[PDB]
Paper text:
Aminoacyl-[name] synthetases (ARSs) play an essential role in protein biosynthesis through the attachment of amino acids to their cognate tRNAs, which is the first step in the translation process. For possible cooperativity and synergistic effects, nine ARSs assemble into the multi-[name] synthetase complex (MSC) with three scaffold proteins: aminoacyl-[name] synthetase complex-interacting multifunctional proteins 1, 2 and 3 (AIMP1, [name] and AIMP3). Among the three scaffold proteins, [name] possesses the most binding sites for MSC components.
Here, we report the crystal structure of a ternary sub­complex of the MSC, [name]–AIMP2GST–EPRSGST (the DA2E subcomplex). The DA2E crystals belonged to space group P61 and contained two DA2E subcomplexes in the asymmetric unit, each comprising two molecules of [name], AIMP2GST and EPRSGST. The [name] structure in the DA2E complex did not exhibit noticeable structural changes compared with that of [name] alone, in that the anticodon-binding domain (residues 57–146) and the catalytic domain (residues 189–497) of [name] could be well modeled. Extra spherical electron densities observed at the [name] dimeric interfaces were coordinated by two His204/Glu208 pairs, each from one monomer, and were modeled as Zn2+ ions according to the metal-content analysis results using ICP-MS. AIMP2GST and EPRSGST both adopt a [name] fold consisting of an N-terminal Trx fold and a C-terminal α-helical sub­domain. Interestingly, Ser156 of AIMP2GST seems to play a crucial role in mediating the interaction between [name] and AIMP2GST. All three AIMP2GST mutants could not form binary complexes with [name], which suggests that the hydrogen bond from the side chain of [name] Ser156 is crucial for the interaction with [name] and that Ser156 phosphorylation would disintegrate the MSC assembly.
Residue numbers in the entry:
A (entry chain F), F (entry chain E): 3 to 159
B (entry chain A): 23 to 154, 179 to 225, 247 to 273, 281 to 495
C (entry chain D), E (entry chain C): 117 to 170, 180 to 288, 292 to 320
D (entry chain B): 23 to 154, 179 to 224, 247 to 273, 282 to 495
């Protein structure tokens, strides 16, 4: 019933990871095109990457990717904006990554000891970032972020 | 009784309520604020009552107004009864109406108006009698004289700092107990530690042990010790200028009880050298030696002679004889019997005894041996100057003594807030 | 939260009108101990902003501060600090609990993103495009959600009031519809 | 030798001459004053010399400039010899020419220029050695850190007075030996119609002595009138140091790194119950009426910094049991008091409260604390005649200076510490 | 005097130019330690007057003070304090010792009285009468004394320079004759 | 060859007293007219009372009424102005007389332990003053002035 067209030139990494986690809940198909469009109805489409992520997590009820309350719900909204801006750019990345490190000091997942859109949207953008992969090779990547990234890379194959 | 709500002994103020109430100061009750409903928190100075009327003198920090509780459209008979029954010095919240008086109330400070009472609450009930020994001093400091003296003394301390701080000084904190001595040592160490200009307001000590508050200056100069002396002088001038401008109310309040002519001084403070002073005393008929120190009576006389000629209560006596001054006093390079020392006098009584300090370790040690001091027990002090010791002078004043001689009072105890008998 | 207090660090150079509207709305639902403060970072905050708000259930501590992005610190011992006036706006409005389906909720969140990023910090090009999508939407429905007033309406209106382009008919009716409401006028008057 | 007039150990300054000479301060030697013949009196911080040239670091009150004695059109060989032979810390009168430098002198405060020397006289010859006693402390107070700390501490005292005096306060002088604590005298002044009083003087609490800035203020109806005043006064001190004394803050920062001091304009106030909720949420087993342990005070400050981001907050409505007898009990909850503490970087600086101005209740609370009324008869008797409602609080000048600059030990902000 | 110092208390509202001229004359005869001071009585003395001058034989201490009549206190232990800028002027000039006969000396003293009282504090009536007596006198003799310059000339000239009548021919020549002298121009420039 | 014409309507008391003390030295006559004029020569006349006093004291060398130096000479000039202004008027006389009292505290004569113009010019004006004679009757006249006035009234009558 659900269909997603993705920019083949630049795939939305986080969206696909989300799609793979909602296959169990609601029937969704993957086409390859020139831009990111989630076709829900004849009247209902979404261009923005975050809009797509948000819908999938909401409609995928059993998945529980949008937390377990308004507080966790809001934490996720923060990380979607965080990933979309501060990680999407490599400007003052040394600061950005240290904030994400501090946030992961006593957290296993980013929100509520379970896999959330936060985990996906951040990890996806973080993998796609250049300066991140350089920090890993040069072994100047913070402790808590590395352990978290390593743990998700294991679960996400 | 219909005014039972309007008066009474109100509950102890344990911070229960934050009332939308404006307690106007007594000094602000002038003609400008006539025919206005105002709240006042004051003490009951005196409360005379005759039949239908009760008059109170509501007092607040050396200011008082005439309050009136009249039976009629405002108050009841039991309220007027209660108003006169309020014991002396009890603090009261008063909701009254300022009404213009037909003739001046010469007794009160607020002569232009009286306060027509509508409410009176005793917030603090004073016990009836009044003593005449700690509680003694508490009442004594309510006297318009004491209030004026010590509010002005606070002024001296402020004018002293504001002056020096503005001319680029740094306030230091001398310890004043060591295991109790004089603070000069610490000021000189600060000078030797690149603190160019330092002052310290703190308690100092002199067949008795005496404690008083001293305002001390120590300043590193360029080439001449007059650079410091002329600064200390200007600072004392700026204090006098300050008191005569701002604290005119407080001066007159002390004048009213203790008559004294206004304090007089010259803008470039008068300086007499020691030789000049001897000539004035000898012309005035005083057998005195060239190297003798000014006896306390001669200091009193010389001040009168200066007042007679120049008409200034404040002058500087410079170039004292070296013999009479302490060891650390820098000798005069031309006349080695004279020093680079100075005293400053208010109404012919010494307030300050300053000089240029010996910043050369060797000469400081020589003068210490001349005065027969065991170098062993001042080794530390001398050692302070061995590494880059700049040329410096200074001087200190007794806060109480300055306040006393400015207002022309007799005994120092008058300007000491907590004297210890 | 054991803190029981919504702390919001906001930059006085760009006052978050979206949050001031939602604050008035929050007080109309709950007993809110609202307080305004000025952080050491900022000096000489405009007079109007200092007194912009003229036991209890919620605390609302608005601190005027030299931060790049409007931040909310609520129940730090359970919740990561929230960044973005859009993200904070969603949270505040969601306290009333006007539950929406997945399609609307996502479309409401989409409307916030548009207002915050594309409309606010955009050229006359993008502004014109935003008006069309609003004009078309408001042509069919009374609000942007269409069912009832939503955070989408609050934030977008707030952004439009804090910025040139020709304004369509439906947006003018929606603007007065918003301005007519008590929380919108009260907040906007105390900003000037 | 032809420059024998231009240098030497000049005669001890016994005030012989009044020279037409302008000794310009080192801080004033900027690019604006380039290519000018200026006189400078400074100390020789360090004097490195290599063959034809001798470089000196002329220092004055935590400011230093690079001075150069070059043989040629200016100086002789014996002058350059003498320049390097000047012992460390010796004070020198220098007639030089300010010349713009091709590259910044990162070491000195005056980076824009150097001083081309024409004359150098040692007015005060420092003995060669430098100790590392009393003379120890003299040198220690020349360190740019000490200079900056104590020039800023002087600032606190000035900002404290200027603030209160402008609010209509009166400075009193408590008698420091009869040797005990000053609160008694402030309260007697309040009882003697002195509405608003403060006292800067040495306080005591092995005997330890420190300098305390004390406030005692008579209020109208609520003790918050005083608390909110004391708070604003501490705010005005912080605002003052961050405006004027920015040079002195950075000079201490350079040696002891510390983030700028952060505070809110309406100073943050947490009531005791609110603080317990924050500590219990943070996992601290504590009683409702217990006093905050020194470690909990440290923690609570960090929790406040985490949430509000202020190093300065007020803890209000303390438990009555833990406070002194003269502390006015809360009229609603008689287990609580009208008391408060104020914290800088999570360490207590102030411990104030509303005073009991009723003689009877003051006596009751004295018996509750098991005091012999006989030996405090005088104090109680002070309030019997027209005692107004009043509160107050005191701060440790050294402790405030320490926690503002974020230094570790109090000795750093004590000018003359007694071992 | 054992004090060795001429103290002169003068009101800055009416500067005694007569004494400032004589001061310059005194310094041209003796070694004078001249000093200017401001008494507590007067506040904010004009700038020019404060630095109007810009061991030794005589002291000359000029104190600017709120006194009705210009006063001199010299050797108080032998001499009553002198009041009147006329009386002080006579004393200062007499220190040079240009001894005159009884007729001239009295006529010189008479000229001082005229200048101080009748001319200074007089109507256009009396001023005109003074000019005639001067014009007639200066018509016969080079000065008002005629032997040489006298205190009479100093004081009168000083009074004329410190006040709307037609000035005669002889007075104009006598005015420039005075103004041409070193002590008269130096003193008058430091007043203007 | 000296002649003095005096205002008969108001005699110059001090001038006459001076004239009586110079009779021994230089030959002087007294005419009575409408104003005070001392006729010295055909060219030399004096209208002002002080001018007359000054001339007589100067020309009367042996009398020594103008002191014994410039200091005493100046003291006298002060008292001539003092008498002519502060005593000639009865305005704030209470102050004026107390100054003259202070000056006579340790002085027998006003100048130099001998009769001077000061003594005459002051005493004359003081006798002629109304408020003075009232202070004497009411016995509120200062001590030193009374004793001095009593001593001169004895020598002058
Ligand atoms: Zn101050």
């Amino acid at each position: 019933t659900l269909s997603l067209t993705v920019n083949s030139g630049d795939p939305p990494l986080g969206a696909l990871l989300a799609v793979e986690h909602v296959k169990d809940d609601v029937s969704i198909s993957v086409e390859e095109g020139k831009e990111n469009i989630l076709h829900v109805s004849e009247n209902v489409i979404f261009t923005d990457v975050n809009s797509i992520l948000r819908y999938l997590a909401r409609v995928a009820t059993t998945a529980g990717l949008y937390g377990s309350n308004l507080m966790e719900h809001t934490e996720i909204d923060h990380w979607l904006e965080f990933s979309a801006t501060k990680l999407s750019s490599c400007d003052s990345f040394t600061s950005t990554i240290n904030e994400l490190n501090h946030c992961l000091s006593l957290r296993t997942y980013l929100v509520g000891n379970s896999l959330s859109l936060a985990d996906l949207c951040v990890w996806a953008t973080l993998k796609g970032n250049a300066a991140w992969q350089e920090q890993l090779k040069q072994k100047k990547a913070p402790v808590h972020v590395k352990r978290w990234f390593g743990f998700l890379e294991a679960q996400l194959e | 009784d219909y005014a039972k709500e309007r008066y009474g002994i109100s509950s102890m103020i344990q911070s229960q309520e934050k009332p939308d109430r404006v307690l106007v100061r007594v000094r602000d009750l002038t003609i400008q604020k006539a025919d206005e409903v105002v709240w006042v928190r004051a003490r009951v100075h005196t409360s005379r009552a005759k039949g239908k009327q009760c008059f109170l003198v509501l007092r607040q920090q050396q200011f008082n107004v005439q309050a009136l509780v009249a039976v009629g459209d405002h108050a009841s008979k039991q309220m007027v009864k209660f108003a006169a029954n309020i014991n002396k010095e009890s603090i009261v919240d008063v909701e009254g109406v300022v009404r213009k008086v037909n003739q001046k109330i010469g007794s009160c400070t607020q002569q232009d108006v009286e306060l027509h009472v509508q409410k009176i609450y005793v917030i603090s009930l004073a016990e009836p009698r009044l003593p005449l020994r700690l509680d003694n001093r508490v009442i004594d400091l309510r006297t318009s004289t004491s209030q004026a003296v010590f509010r002005l003394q606070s002024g001296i301390c402020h004018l002293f700092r504001e002056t020096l701080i503005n001319k680029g000084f740094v306030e230091i904190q001398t310890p004043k107990i060591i295991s109790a001595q004089s603070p000069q040592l610490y000021k000189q160490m600060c000078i030797c530690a690149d603190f160019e200009k330092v002052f310290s307001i703190g308690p100092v000590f002199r067949r008795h042990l005496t404690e008083f508050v001293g305002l001390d200056i120590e300043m590193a100069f360029n080439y001449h010790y007059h650079e410091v002396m002329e600064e200390i002088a200007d600072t004392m001038v700026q204090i006098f200028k300050g008191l005569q401008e701002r604290f005119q109310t407080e001066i007159q309040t002390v004048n009213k009880q203790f008559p004294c002519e206004p304090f007089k001084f010259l803008e470039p403070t008068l300086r007499l050298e020691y030789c000049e002073a001897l000539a004035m005393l000898r012309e005035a008929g005083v057998e005195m030696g060239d190297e003798d120190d000014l006896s306390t009576p001669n200091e009193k006389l010389l001040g009168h002679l200066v007042k007679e000629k120049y008409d200034t209560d404040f002058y500087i006596l410079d170039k004292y004889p070296l013999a009479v001054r302490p060891f650390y006093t820098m000798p005069d390079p031309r006349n080695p019997k004279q020093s680079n020392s100075y005293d400053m006098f208010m109404r012919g009584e010494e307030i300050l005894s300053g000089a240029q300090r010996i910043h050369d370790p060797q000469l400081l040690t020589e003068r210490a041996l001349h005065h027969g001091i065991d170098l062993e027990k001042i080794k530390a002090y001398i050692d302070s100057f061995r590494f880059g010791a700049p040329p410096h002078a200074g001087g200190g004043i007794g806060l109480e003594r300055v306040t006393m001689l400015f207002l022309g009072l007799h005994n120092v105890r008058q300007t000491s807030m907590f004297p210890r008998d | 939260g054991a803190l029981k207090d919504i702390v919001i660090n906001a930059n006085p150079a760009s006052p978050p009108l979206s949050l001031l509207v939602l604050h008035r709305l929050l007080c109309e639902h709950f007993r809110v101990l609202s307080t305004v403060h000025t952080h050491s970072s900022v000096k000489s905050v405009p007079e109007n902003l200092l007194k912009c708000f003229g036991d209890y259930q919620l605390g609302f501590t608005l601190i005027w501060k030299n931060v790049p992005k409007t931040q909310m610190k609520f129940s730090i011992q359970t919740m990561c600090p929230i960044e973005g006036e859009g993200n904070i706006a969603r949270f505040l409005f969601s306290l009333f609990g006007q539950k929406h389906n997945a399609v609307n909720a996502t479309l409401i969140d989409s409307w916030v993103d548009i207002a915050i990023f594309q409309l606010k910090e955009g050229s006359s090009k993008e502004k014109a495009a935003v008006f069309r999508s609003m004009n078309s939407a408001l042509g069919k429905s009374p609000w942007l959600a269409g069912n009832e007033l939503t955070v989408a309406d609050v934030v977008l209106w707030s952004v439009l009031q804090q910025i040139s382009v020709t304004v369509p008919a439906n947006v003018q009716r929606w603007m007065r519809s918003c301005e007519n409401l008590a929380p919108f006028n009260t907040a906007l008057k105390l900003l000037k």
